Structure formats: structure tokens, C-alpha cells
Amino acid sequence: DNNPAHSENYAQRWRNLAAAGNDIYGEARLIDAMAPRGAKILDAGCGQGRIGGYLSKQGHDVLGTDLDPILIDYAKQDFPEARWVVGDLSVDQISETDFDLIVSAGNVMGFLAEDGREPALANIHRALGADGRAVIGFGAGRGWVFGDFLEVAERVGLELENAFESWDLKPFVQGSEFLVAVFTKK
């Protein structure tokens, strides 16, 4: 009996998040630590803008892209000092470039079709500035085998700089169940 008249408006969203008090900004903290001040940052697969929105509040120039139009609408309401766009990274080229940082923190790789994976990563690569970095974090057993992911990344020209098993920089080791991979361009 669920329908779109059951969802939260702007007030309710804001109050419910402040009242939840959840540690939801870990990924944003890492990107902030890596960023120069006023960096240009792409939140790739941004959902309703949790990471990019936080970054916009730190004075960065943020663009968030996601395929879900309802969530981009929430982002536009919640974070009007950032820029937000509906698009599917596997099929729709990102036309903007020279991003200092690009972050993927969605952790929803299983929804990305196999044939969309290389185009998605080539897309990231093209949007990256010459001296920019891409930081992509997702879990084991959540739609993408880490070795294939790295292979696809390297094939499109994203060069692994380092890898961690968490957004708080614990080292990626044998049997690690999560990957945060940092890439440079070319």
C-alpha cells in the first residue's frame, strides 16, 4: 500500500537526519582531507547528495550526478550551493572535466550492467583533471569482483595509486572485505 504520498518533504527529511544522528559523512571526510580548498569535485552516483552536499558546505565546487531523478531533486532542495544532474554514467557522457577529485561512495555496483562498467569508468577518467584523483569505495560481494574492477579501471587509463579497506584508511590486505581505491589519470 506504499505510494509517493508516504515520502518525506523537505522539513521532514532535514529533521529526520538531524534526529537520526548517524555517522554518514566518513566518505566526505576523506575526500575533504585529500582536497585543496575550493576544489572542483564530482560526486559520481551521488544519490540524494550526502557526500557532495557535505563537500559543498566545505567551500568546494561540487557537481553530483545520479540516474535517479527523485534523489537528484532532493539534492537540489537540500544542497542549493552545489550543482546536480540526472544521468546514467554507463550511457551518458559527463561533458564537464578538470575535476580535482571524483568520488564514488554509493556502494551499489550490482545495479551497473556488465557492459556498462568499462564505459562508466572511461567516463570518470575523461572527467578527471590531469592531476586529479578518483576515489571509488565499495564492498566485497556487492556486485563487482575487486580484481576485475581494477582491471577495467587500468584498461581505461585510471592508474591505481593506493588502496584501503575503509574510508578511514585501514590498509587493504588479503581477505579485505571492502575497497577504497585511489586512482590517478593515465
Q: CATH no. for residue 23?
A: 3.40.50.150
Instruction: Kindly calculate the radius of gyration of the chain based on its CA atoms and give it in whole angstroms.
Output: 16
Identify how the structure was determined. X-ray
Angle between helices 69-78 and 50-57 (to 10 degrees): 20
Structural domain harbouring 72: 1-186
Nine-digit cell at 79? 544542497
**Total of domains in the chain:** 1
User: What residues contact 61, with CB distance under 8 A and at least 6 apart?
Assistant: 38, 39, 40, 41
